[PDB]
């Protein structure tokens, strides 16, 4: 009946853990300990984008590594020209509680959402000179927590109602629904091939989803608190996790277990955003201590520190070419960082 | 050059509109409606003048925004920081649910977690103890001891209502830096908007002195 189902569930969990331990011979630290250290990393603020009048929650870069889109609590979406600091667009929003924003790979659409539980897509290329809303994705019973663009017609939306969905643009219907989490999913990261994505939720677990069949591939655990940040390795065989505690974790898709732990005693605050470099060697993570830390992804050593914000760093990411890093924060400022 | 101007001029026009929007928003008052289980929330909404509901009403030339997040149905700790810096929080408690895991105890539990919140260290709290007409009839047949085992007073409405207010007012641990306003309202009460306007006046006074450095 109902009693033996739980018993076989624990047996299956034990077998999975035993399989994970069986395929664990040497950790990443032992293998990498022979290579040369990355050294100290120095980065300087090249551009300071001002104009937002509230806390900034979204940062997502553009595919051309020049155009930036940011969201804040004033109900305005501003498209930034990072090279010239000029504001390309200023999109007013019906609801000022937007938490995430997305930039389409083609650069023609921008999507945002928040406590309204609606993912609104805004057209940037129209005959008229204004930016108009194109679609309003409704059907989620929780706050919008992440949105990523696969192409001009498919968008994956993470919401606070514990479920993730894949939407269609020209028809406002949910193509597939992703279920299996027990807490609110706060972030999602797409693979380079646009075939899989990983979502981190508040149950200290991360799930790998397949877009086409709409079901969970693997489940990753190891964190102690809610997961707020996620980023996908350029390989596609790994991803990094940032939780509400002071620990960053790197997971392997093929090994299906924890690989390397990024933590320090002086850090007590949580992680809001996590991003990787072009080669996947530097792990950049924002923290609640008004500071950004650069981690050596292979040795867990703190390579450098980005201290240029007077408030919590909420959003962070790296350009497609990896030349510049743009950091957003609650102080209503955007900062672009480059090496000497 | 002859092409930097065109992009810069368009950019400069945006901050002109951004500054105007910010100035208009800075003159507005934001209110957080934070009742539990529809504890007379709809009654006070109509008495002033979907994930989150926005309500706008004008009183004494002051613009008010009320945000209702009762339909969110999610973990509060993941989005309650978005309301940091709000002018005040409006709390609605029905006095008639003391005879309904108890409905009253749930109200105090969420009140305690919200009043003693890191993002709401010094925010004003307006407590609305509504449904007082039904409370008077219920207290004449059902004692208050069903909800509060430690109650020692009689079943008179005046002291029973005061006892509930004292327990709610005793849940805050920062009485030296924040104040809770309690007002008993009913369906026919017409002074609710005046009470809210009076409560936010000191908040404006609070911010005015901070601007000139007195606080």
């Amino acid at each position: 009946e109902l009693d033996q189902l739980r018993q076989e569930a624990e047996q299956l969990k034990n077998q999975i853990r035993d399989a994970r331990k069986a395929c664990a011979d040497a950790t990443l630290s032992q293998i990498t300990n022979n290579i040369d250290p990355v050294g100290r990393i120095q980065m300087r603020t090249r551009r300071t984008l001002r104009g937002h009048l509230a806390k900034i929650y979204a940062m997502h870069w553009g595919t051309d590594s020049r155009l930036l889109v940011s969201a804040s609590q004033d109900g305005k979406l501003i498209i930034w020209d990072s090279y010239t600091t000029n504001k390309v667009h200023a999109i007013p929003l019906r609801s000022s509680w937007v938490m995430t924003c997305a930039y389409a790979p083609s650069g023609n659409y921008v999507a945002c959402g928040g406590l309204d539980n609606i993912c609104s897509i805004y057209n940037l290329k129209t005959r008229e000179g204004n930016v108009r809303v194109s679609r309003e994705l409704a059907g989620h019973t929780g706050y919008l927590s992440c949105c990523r663009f696969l192409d001009d017609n498919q968008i994956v939306t993470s919401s606070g109602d514990t479920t993730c969905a894949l939407w269609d643009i020209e028809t406002g219907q949910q193509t597939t629904t992703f279920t299996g989490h027990t807490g609110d999913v706060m972030s999602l990261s797409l693979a380079p091939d646009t075939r899989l994505f990983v979502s981190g939720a508040c149950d200290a677990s991360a799930k790998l989803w397949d877009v086409r069949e709409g079901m969970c591939r693997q489940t990753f655990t190891g964190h102690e608190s809610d997961i707020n940040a996620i980023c996908f390795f350029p390989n596609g065989n790994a991803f990094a996790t940032g939780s509400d505690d002071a620990t960053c974790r790197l997971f392997d898709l093929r090994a299906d277990q924890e690989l390397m732990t990024y933590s320090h005693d002086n850090i007590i605050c949580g992680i809001t955003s996590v991003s990787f470099s072009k080669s996947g060697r530097l792990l950049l993570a924002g923290y609640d201590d008004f500071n950004c830390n650069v981690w050596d992804a292979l040795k867990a050593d703190r390579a450098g520190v980005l201290a240029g914000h007077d408030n919590r760093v909420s959003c962070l990411g790296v350009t497609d070419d990896g030349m510049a890093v743009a950091t957003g924060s609650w102080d209503s400022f955007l900062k672009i960082w480059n090496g000497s | 050059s002859a092409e930097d101007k065109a992009a810069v001029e368009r950019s400069k026009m945006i901050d002109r509109n951004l500054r105007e929007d910010g100035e208009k928003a800075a003159r507005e008052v934001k209110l957080l409606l934070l009742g539990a289980g529809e504890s007379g929330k709809s009654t006070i909404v109509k008495q002033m003048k979907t994930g989150i509901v926005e309500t706008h009403f004008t009183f004494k030339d002051l613009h008010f925004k009320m945000f209702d997040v009762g339909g969110q149905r999610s973990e509060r700790k993941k989005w309650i920081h978005c309301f940091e810096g709000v002018t005040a929080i409006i709390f609605c408690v029905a006095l008639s649910d003391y005879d309904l895991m108890n409905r009253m105890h749930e109200s105090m539990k969420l009140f305690d977690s919200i009043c003693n919140n890191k993002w709401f260290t010094d925010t004003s709290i307006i407590l609305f103890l509504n449904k007082k007409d039904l409370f008077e009839e219920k207290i004449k047949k059902s004692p208050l001891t069903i909800c509060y085992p430690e109650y020692a007073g009689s079943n008179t409405y005046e002291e029973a209502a005061a006892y509930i207010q004292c327990q709610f007012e005793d849940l805050n641990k920062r009485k030296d830096t924040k104040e809770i306003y309690t007002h008993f309202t009913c369906a026919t009460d017409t002074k609710n908007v005046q009470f809210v306007f009076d409560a936010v006046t000191d908040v404006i006074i609070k911010n005015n002195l901070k601007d000139c450095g007195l606080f």
Partner: single-chain antibody
Framework: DVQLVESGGGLVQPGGSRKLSCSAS????????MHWVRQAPEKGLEWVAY????????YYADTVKGRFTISRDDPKNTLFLQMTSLRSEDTAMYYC??????????????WGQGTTLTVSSSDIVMTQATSSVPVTPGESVSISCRSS???????????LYWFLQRPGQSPQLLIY???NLASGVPDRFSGSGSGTAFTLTISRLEAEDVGVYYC?????????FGAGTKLELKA
């Protein structure tokens, strides 16, 4: 449906005054800058005046400075061009062209129908190829362009624009910044160049490609149009 209707033209005595009204409908006129371009009878295009989106920046051609003034009415979506001391050389077809910061440039995508004005009585030089070339459908055409000054800028943008004026129709933008295809233009057209020499190539010819092709630089203001190359079908 973007529309720009021009009205207020007719016979004018020399030394008189007139005003041109360009009504805008179907687009955000407030955020669009406006240009005035006239075409003399059996001649080429020439820029007259430009007004910014916020009216802060206003420029005039050297041949119309002082006599001509330009104004816009954003609430009524109407563009004005007041004229004083009209000469016999001002007889042309005036076009109001919308222009906004688009795709990292300032395109001239939409042109008005035009109005008839009859008056009875340092600049970059763009040199065009032979004014007439005989072509037949199915072939590939190559139109050249030469600039006195290098249109390549320090930011990597070469500000060269290509237009097609069909017989009896207003000019239409084809190529902006020498490399980008405008919206609604077939992929047959292509643009290439380096510094001062530019080439526009049509891969597959069609009967709808008949017209005069114009090149204008947006490097300095002071926008100058080429003589124009006319494409005619062989008999």
């Amino acid at each position: 449906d973007v529309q720009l209707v021009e009205s207020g033209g007719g016979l004018v005595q020399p030394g008189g005054s007139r005003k041109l009204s360009c009504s805008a409908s179907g687009f955000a006129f407030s955020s669009f800058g406006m240009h005035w371009v006239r075409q003399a009878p059996e001649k080429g295009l020439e820029w007259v005046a430009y007004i910014s989106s916020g009216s802060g920046t206003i420029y005039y051609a050297d041949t119309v400075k002082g006599r001509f003034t330009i104004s816009r009415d954003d609430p009524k979506n109407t563009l004005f061009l007041q004229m004083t001391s009209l000469r016999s050389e001002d007889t042309a077809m005036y076009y109001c062209v919308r222009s906004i910061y688009y795709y990292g440039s300032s395109p001239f995508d939409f042109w008005g129908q035009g109005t008839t004005l009859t008056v009875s009585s340092s600049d970059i030089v763009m040199t065009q190829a032979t004014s007439s070339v005989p072509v037949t459908p199915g072939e590939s055409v190559s139109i050249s362009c030469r600039s006195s000054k290098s249109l390549l800028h320090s930011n990597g943008n070469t500000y060269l624009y290509w237009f097609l004026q069909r017989p009896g129709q207003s000019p239409q933008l084809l190529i902006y910044r020498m490399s980008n295809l405008a919206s609604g233009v077939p992929d047959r057209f292509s643009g290439s160049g380096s510094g001062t020499a530019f080439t526009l190539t049509i891969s597959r010819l069609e009967a709808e490609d008949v017209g005069v092709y114009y090149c204008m630089q947006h490097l300095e203001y002071p926008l100058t149009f080429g003589a124009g190359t006319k494409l005619e079908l062989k008999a």
